[PDB]
Amino acid sequence: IVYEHTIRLNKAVRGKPSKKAAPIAIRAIRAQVEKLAKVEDVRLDPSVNVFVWSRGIRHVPRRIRLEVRLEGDDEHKFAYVINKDVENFKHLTTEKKGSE
Amino acid sequence: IGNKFRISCGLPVGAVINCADNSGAKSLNMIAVKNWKGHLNRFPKASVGDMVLITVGRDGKPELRRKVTPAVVVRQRKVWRRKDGVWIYFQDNAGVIINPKGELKGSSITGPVAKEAADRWPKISTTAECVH
């Protein structure tokens, strides 16, 4: 089950100090995946970390698209969030790739 | 003359306003405003059409200076709201020396003069070239 969702990180740091933007952004990615995944464990590929910090700790990209897979077993289902680089974030919305 | 609708007062006391008349004064220092009751700590304030007690600056002709003179502010840099909703402001703050009776001390009022100043004081209205 591979969810495909975009997240606007500009909307995430709204209300928080610019110096801690990228750390706040990473937390938002964990929290906003948890809402989609419905499972608590979220592990983000190092690629997701590099993208959020591409333009520094104060000017995180305005939007990031993440492909998240829910692979897990023995009740510890976890979501593995990767970074999908998109030229256009225009007509982009949840695009789950099937189930199980 | 008549009743003046409140306009934002842009020139506090200590303001120096230009002279718009050929009286021979160039700069007028606002000592006070006529009809002002005060509140503790509040400097007197004045706007277009209000009589202000002024003193002529050192640049002025000797006869005019060293005495308090009454004048009416005719131009105000601060924007003000007329009842119709018009917000109007002027390039400079200027005044014309006029006795409380309403006799101008000057033959001509140079430059634009505000409508409010012109209605309240009749002699300013005839003399002013334009009432924008």
Partner: protein, 378 residues
């Protein structure tokens, strides 16, 4: 010693205690004088502030510099989804003071009104007026109860519910208000008038007329814990002062040994029930009419909706009342409008030359989407 220079107190002690309003919405409290000789009229109506606008007006105020002259004023649109009566409450005048003498509820109470009864409708058991519906339905019980009101009641009130589905907000649960019935020749006529309005819609047009002045009641905009300088209006002290200049310096003398309630102290500013008064009703109309707010000079259909929608409010699909100036409260807040208790005698007559439907979101120059489309054309 003495203050030396005379200065007034800062703030109205009448408006103390300055606490967040515990009452949920602005309450009518006192209602207009009955008169005892007028067509029976309801005296109040709830509204949700929709927005503010500009209205060009022609002034007929004799003796004023504005006579025979145009003016532009702040208007405040109060969205008015039509209310529905759900009950009638009668009140005996007792020595202790007005005390209720029983209320007769509607045979059928609407879901919005029922939603008000519960904190969570989905998880509740919907057990409201369950045995009441059976006791009524036939309606013989309702008439018997209404008859008890006719003899034992002197002040009659109508309970009414707003429907928030036809309003852009997410309240979903209804707001209930006891609107007084005034002016009828006698109490028996008053309750008869009430039965006709029962379980049927009431519109602002019936309650208030253009040209009348109404008193607007609502909870004010909340600023949270504020400093004395913002909350009570005091001076920011000299900027050469240690420990801060945003504080009243001395809060009392040696004696009285206690801080007096007069002295300004820092607390909650905002969310206060306040009643404004004598705001003239410029225009009552429905947004369903395309030409509802059109005037002869514009020559455009001009509905009440600004281009891009009211800001922090939405569709205003139904009827609306426009008041002169401002009413207490932020946009999206319930505001009880009540007939004036003391109207201003020398108010001019309202004739609106132009209304502004230019977008309030940003600065608008086009009053219709078609008008903005025409300008940008290609």
């Amino acid at each position: 010693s003495h203050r030396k220079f005379s200065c007034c107190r800062k703030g109205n002690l009448g408006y103390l205690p300055r606490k967040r309003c515990t009452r949920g919405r602005g309450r009518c409290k006192t209602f207009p004088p009955d008169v005892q000789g007028a067509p029976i009229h309801l005296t109040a109506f709830l509204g949700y502030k929709a927005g503010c606008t500009h209205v060009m007006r022609f002034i007929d105020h004799r003796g004023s510099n504005l006579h025979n002259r145009q003016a532009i004023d702040q208007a405040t649109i109060i969205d008015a989804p039509p209310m529905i009566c759900t009950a009638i409450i009668g009140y005996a005048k007792t020595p202790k003071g007005l005390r209720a003498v029983t209320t007769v509820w509607a045979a059928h109470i609407a879901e919005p009104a029922m939603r008000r009864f519960y904190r969570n409708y989905f998880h509740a058991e919907k057990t409201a007026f369950s045995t009441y519906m059976k006791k009524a339905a036939d309606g013989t019980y309702i008439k018997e109860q209404l008859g008890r009101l006719k003899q034992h009641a002197d002040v009659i009130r109508i309970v009414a519910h707003t429907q928030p589905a036809l309003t852009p907000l997410k309240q979903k649960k209804a707001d209930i208000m006891e609107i007084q019935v005034n002016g009828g020749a006698n109490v028996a006529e008053k309750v008869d008038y009430a039965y006709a309005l029962m379980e049927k819609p009431i519109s602002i047009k019936d309650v208030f007329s253009v040209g009348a002045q109404i008193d607007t009641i609502s909870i004010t905009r909340g600023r949270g814990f504020e400093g004395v300088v913002t909350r009570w209006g005091v001076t920011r002290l000299p900027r050469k002062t240690r420990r801060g200049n945003r504080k009243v310096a001395c809060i009392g003398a040696w004696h009285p040994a206690n801080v007096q309630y007069t002295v300004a102290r820092a607390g909650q500013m905002g969310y206060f029930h306040r009643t404004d008064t004598n705001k003239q009703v410029f225009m009552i109309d429905t947004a369903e009419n395309p030409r509802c707010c059109t005037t002869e000079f514009d020559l455009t259909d001009k509905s009440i909706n600004p281009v891009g929608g009211f800001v922090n409010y939405g569709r205003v699909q139904g009827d609306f009342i426009m008041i002169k100036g401002t009413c207490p409260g932020p946009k999206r807040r319930p505001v009880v409008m009540r007939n004036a208790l003391l109207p201003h005698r020398n108010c001019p007559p309202v004739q609106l030359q132009w209304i502004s439907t230019a977008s309030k979101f940003g600065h608008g120059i086009f009053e219709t989407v078609e008008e903005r489309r025409q300008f940008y054309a290609k």
